[PDB]
Design a protein around this ligand. Sequence first.
Ligand SMILES: NC(=O)c1ccc[n+]([C@@H]2O[C@H](COP(=O)([O-])OP(=O)(O)OC[C@H]3O[C@@H](n4cnc5c(N)ncnc54)[C@H](OP(=O)(O)O)[C@@H]3O)[C@@H](O)[C@H]2O)c1
Ligand SMILES: NC(=O)c1ccc[n+]([C@@H]2O[C@H](COP(=O)([O-])OP(=O)(O)OC[C@H]3O[C@@H](n4cnc5c(N)ncnc54)[C@H](OP(=O)(O)O)[C@@H]3O)[C@@H](O)[C@H]2O)c1
Ligand SMILES: Nc1nc(=O)c2c([nH]1)NC[C@@H](CCc1ccc(C(=O)N[C@@H](CCC(=O)O)C(=O)O)cc1)C2
Lengths: 295, 287
Amino acid sequence: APAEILNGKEISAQIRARLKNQVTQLKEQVPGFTPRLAILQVGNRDDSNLYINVKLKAAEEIGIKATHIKLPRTTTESEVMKYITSLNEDSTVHGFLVQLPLDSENSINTEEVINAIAPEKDVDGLTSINAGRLARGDLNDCFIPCTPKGCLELIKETGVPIAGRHAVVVGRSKIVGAPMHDLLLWNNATVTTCHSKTAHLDEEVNKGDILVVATGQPEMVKGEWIKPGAIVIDCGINYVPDDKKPNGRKVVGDVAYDEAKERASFITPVPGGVGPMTVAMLMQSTVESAKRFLE
Amino acid sequence: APAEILNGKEISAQIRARLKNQVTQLKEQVPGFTPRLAILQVGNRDDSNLYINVKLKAAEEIGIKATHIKLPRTTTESEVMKYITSLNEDSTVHGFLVQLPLDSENSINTEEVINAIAPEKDVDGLTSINAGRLARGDLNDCFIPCTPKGCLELIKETGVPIAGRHAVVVGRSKIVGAPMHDLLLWNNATVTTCHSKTAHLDEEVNKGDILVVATGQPEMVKGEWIKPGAIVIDCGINYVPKVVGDVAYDEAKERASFITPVPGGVGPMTVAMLMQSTVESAKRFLE
Ligand SMILES: NC(=O)c1ccc[n+]([C@@H]2O[C@H](COP(=O)([O-])OP(=O)(O)OC[C@H]3O[C@@H](n4cnc5c(N)ncnc54)[C@H](OP(=O)(O)O)[C@@H]3O)[C@@H](O)[C@H]2O)c1
Ligand SMILES: NC(=O)c1ccc[n+]([C@@H]2O[C@H](COP(=O)([O-])OP(=O)(O)OC[C@H]3O[C@@H](n4cnc5c(N)ncnc54)[C@H](OP(=O)(O)O)[C@@H]3O)[C@@H](O)[C@H]2O)c1
Ligand SMILES: Nc1nc(=O)c2c([nH]1)NC[C@@H](CCc1ccc(C(=O)N[C@@H](CCC(=O)O)C(=O)O)cc1)C2
C-alpha cells in the first residue's frame, strides 16, 4: 500500500495562517508592539531579488513589518559590518538576516559578516553561536535554519513519535544536514549521519525509520534502499530538462520518488514538499524572536 | 586472544614530554614569556580537588604556569562572572577553564558562565562559539574539548584510518559525547549517536568499527555487543564495590582489536590534551 504524501504546500499555508492570527493577537495584547524583520542585501542579483520579495510578501501578509536594505555593489566589508552592528543595536528589529551570496566588487569575508549577527536576532540560524546552541541541545530558545526546521515539522505532521526511532541523515551541510542531525537527536532519535565518504550507503539508508536526504545528487537514493514503512523527507531541488512541462524543466528530488513512494509510509514529493515550508519557517522564527523580546 | 591495549598512560607521557620541549623552546626564543593557565573552581568537591591537582601537576611538569582560584560554596553567578571577566582581561593568562560541575548553594546557570569565557582562552572548548565551529566542521580555528580530543588521539594510535568506518558514540553530553560525534564525523566516519532513549542499544553498538562510550553507567556495554575487530574507547570513570569503565572490559577485550583500559586509558589523555590546548593558546597569543 503506497505512502501518504506530505503536502508541504498545504501544511505551509496552514502555518502562515496560524502565524497571522498569532501576530494579530500579539498586537491586541500589547498595543504598539510591531514584530519586525530586516533583510540586508549586498548588490543586485536577480535570484536574490526574487527570493527577498517572496520573504517580504509573506511577512506583510502575516502582519510582520519587513525592512529591506539593499546596498550597492561598490559596498565594502567595513560598510556591511556597520549595518550589521546597527541592526543588532536597533531595539525595534527582532530578527534579521543577510541574504547570500553577497554581490560586491570587493572581497568580503562572508563568515565574518554572518558571525557579527547578534545570536538573539539570527533568524536564519547560521551564526556559529546559534549552531553551537542547537548542536548541544538548547532548542527552547536558539534559532533553527529554515530547511531542517521545515523537515522536522513535516516529520511531526505524520503523528509518529520520533523518540527511539533510528533516523538517518544523508548529508552534513551547515544549511541542512548538520542542523537536521541536531533536531533529530534532541527529539530523541538515534541518529546516523552519512556523507560522500560513507561506505555502503544503501545499507545505511535501509536502517532509517526516518530518513532525511540533502545531497544535491538527483534521485541517487533509490526506492530499494528505503526501509519498509519509513518516513522519507527529501530536500533535493534538482533541475532536469523536460519539454512536456510548462517551462521545459522538471524539478526532482534527491530520492527516486516513484519507487520510494511504494516502500515508505510517509514521503515528501518534489516539488511541493520541503520547499514551500521554508519561507513559513523563517516567519515562524521571526515570530519566536519577537515573542522572546516581549519578555 | 586479547585486543591490543591502548596504554593512555604511556601515550600521554610521550605527549607531555613533547609539550615540555616545545615550552622550553618558546622560553629560549622569547625569554621571560611563560605560557599560563588558570582553573576557576566553585565550591570544594573532593573529586574536583583531585582532578585539579592532576592538571596542576601536568602543567608544572611541562613548564606551564598554572593558577588555581577556589571560590566558596556561597558564590553567586554574578561573583563567578567577575572572575571570568578578570581572567578574560588579564593578558598574562593565555587559557582558562571553569571546573565542572559547580558546587554552590545558589543556582548558577552553567551555560551563561561558560559562555562569558573569551573564545581564544576557552581551552576546554565548551563555549557555544567553539562548539558551533566544531559542530559545523570548522576545525581550523577552535578548541576541542579535552576528552574527545584524547579519544581521537587513542583511535589514531591504532593506525587504522577513520574515514569510511561506521562509528558509534554512546552518550551525547556537551563535555564528551556530542563533541566526540563531531570529531568522528569531520574525520569522515559515518557516525551513529546513541543515548538513554535509544532502543536496542546492543544492536546499535554491534555496528561500530569504532566505538566510544561515555555514559557513566558502570560496565553496561557488554562484550557480546562489541563488533569483532572493533576499536573500543571507554571514557567511563565509575566507583564500584575499584574504578571501572562504561564497558565490560574482560569480555570486550576478547572481541575488540584495540581497547582502552580503565584506569589508565582515556583519563591521562584528557589531561595531556588540555595541556596541548593551553600551549596552543600561548603560541597564538605570541602573534
Ligand atoms: N528548499 C530549500 O530552500 C533548500 C535549501 C537548502 C538546500 N536545498 C537542496 O538540498 C540539496 C542539498 O543542499 P545543501 O545546502 O545541503 O548542499 P551541499 O552543501 O552541496 O551538501 C551536500 C551534502 O551531501 C553530501 N553528498 C553529496 N554527494 C553524496 C553522495 N554520493 N553520497 C552521500 N552524501 C553525499 C555531501 O557530502 P560531503 O559533506 O562529504 O561533501 C554534503 O554533506 C540541494 O538539492 C539543494 O538545492 C533546498
Ligand atoms: N576521563 C575523563 O577525562 C572524563 C571527562 C569527562 C567525563 N568522563 C566520564 O565519562 C562518563 C560520562 O561522562 P559525561 O560528562 O558525558 O556524563 P553525563 O553528562 O552524565 O552524560 C551521560 C550520557 O550517557 C547517556 N546514557 C546514560 N545512560 C545510558 C544508557 N542506558 N544507554 C545509553 N546512553 C546512556 C546519557 O543519555 P541522555 O542524554 O539521554 O541523558 C548522556 O548522553 C562518566 O563516567 C564521566 O566520569 C571522563
Ligand atoms: N564533568 C567532569 N567530569 C569528570 O569526570 C571530569 C571532569 N569534569 N573534569 C576533569 C576530568 C579529569 C579526569 C582524570 C582522571 C585521572 C587522570 C589521571 O591522572 N590518570 C591516572 C589515573 C587514570 C584514571 O583515573 O583514568 C593515570 O592512569 O595516570 C586524569 C584525568 C574528569
